[PDB]
């Protein structure tokens, strides 16, 4: 948690549906946005911070909290617009004799600034004698090791945390979703959408040849007349069903 890892995400389509369908990820406390609703949204960058904490400490991973974790290890800002996912890691994180592979910063002269990382190990001088780099009276090493054990109590059993931040920059959004997009019919008017365009028409087959990059079609009178089918690249037509006034 003191040396929390940060994976930056870019240029992909995230099937949030994938983790949103797994009970192991029980703690899905998210602030600033709804998960169902953001699967139809796009951000420039996404950041994935992960680390392992004890069982009841999951609460500190939330905006405006205090404690060893939030003050010295992983602080979220007051104005946080992402999610926190946490699940028990009694799978392999714990060992019979204990895994000396986890540390939590215990002392630090100052609370973190949000999303700040501190991996520097310099004795915490609490007295007024310099410590010179050896632990002793009023001279404390910064980190300590969690005694993860299989029989440990739930509040002290293992726990992984994944923290999703979403940012919006003037840069084009490199992150989106698949949005369950496959359907095609012919010779019947349908509220058809092809990657963003709308309309209704009897979409048939065209003898007309696009160029490989060209997407839409037009006439002398700024009317859409052909849409290349994105999945099976073919030239369609567009014609709304018959209209015209009736006359008695």
């Amino acid at each position, epitope marked *: 948690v003191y040396a929390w*890892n940060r994976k930056r995400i870019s240029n992909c389509v995230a099937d949030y549906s994938v983790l949103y369908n797994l009970a192991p990820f029980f703690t899905f406390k998210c602030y600033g946005v709804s998960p169902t609703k953001l699967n139809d949204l796009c951000f420039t960058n996404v950041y994935a911070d992960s680390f392992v904490i004890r069982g009841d400490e999951v609460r500190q991973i939330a905006p405006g909290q205090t404690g060893n974790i939030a003050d010295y290890n992983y602080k979220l800002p007051d104005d946080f617009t992402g999610c926190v996912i946490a699940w028990n890691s009694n799978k392999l994180d714990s060992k019979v004799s204990g*895994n000396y*592979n986890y540390l939590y910063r215990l002392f630090r002269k100052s609370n973190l600034k949000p999303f700040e990382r501190d*991996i520097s190990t310099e004795i915490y001088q609490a007295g007024n004698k310099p410590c010179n*780099g050896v632990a002793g009276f009023n001279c404390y090493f910064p980190l300590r090791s969690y005694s993860f054990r299989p029989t440990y109590g739930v509040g002290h059993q293992p726990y992984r945390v994944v923290v999703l931040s979403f940012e919006l920059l003037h840069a084009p959004a490199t992150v989106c979703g698949p949005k369950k997009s496959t359907n095609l019919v012919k010779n019947k008017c349908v509220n058809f959408n092809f990657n963003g365009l709308k309309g209704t028409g009897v979409l048939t087959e065209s003898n007309k040849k696009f160029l490989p990059f060209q997407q839409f079609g037009r006439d002398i009178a700024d009317t859409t007349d052909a849409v290349r089918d994105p999945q099976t690249l073919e030239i369609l037509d567009i014609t709304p069903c018959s209209f015209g006034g009736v006359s008695v």
Partner: antibody
Amino acid sequence: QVQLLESGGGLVQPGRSLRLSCAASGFTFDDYAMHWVRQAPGKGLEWVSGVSWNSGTIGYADSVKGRFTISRDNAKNSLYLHMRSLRAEDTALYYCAKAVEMVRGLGADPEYGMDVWGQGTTVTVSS
Amino acid sequence: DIVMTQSPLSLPVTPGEPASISCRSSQSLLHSNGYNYLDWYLQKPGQSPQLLIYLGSNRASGVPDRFSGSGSGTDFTLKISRVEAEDVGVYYCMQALQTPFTFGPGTKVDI
């Protein structure tokens, strides 16, 4: 070309600290699990510590457990090894090696294959 | 906490013949995938060591086709199809399964 440069050597008395640093240059530093391997003077090699692709340590040697502390930084492409309770029996060369299999390229994640080795430092302890 | 041994402890080889070295373990390294995790490394004297074989028998990159690796269970062997003047030094076998990792005492090959 791939370069692994380490620094931090020098005579230090017993009962102090040191901070060895290994810097990598020439590859995507976040798809390779680093390792720190000692080399006693005129003896065989001996694994010391390691770190996976996600900054998650993979345990230390049985006789060294308790003092050494590894840390990584993908932003600066830097791996560091804080050393505590230095004793006379800790004098040796120290190489920082890199794994071979890039992660998710094929069961589990890879950790074997120390292929590229920098020229180690010459840490020593005496009074 | 796995202890490995090598044999022979030290053998003299002459340029133009094959040689065979055996590494033995305590617990068979057959993983669930079916792969042995033992690795063979050559530490040339006066120079940093270099990789020879990874994943039991999959030949490493950039080394010539004169080396062969075989074995399974708790016994593995490395055979130099043809030995030459540039194959002298120390050889080690290192586990890649139950952490911490371990390195054999080392075989000393000379002329």
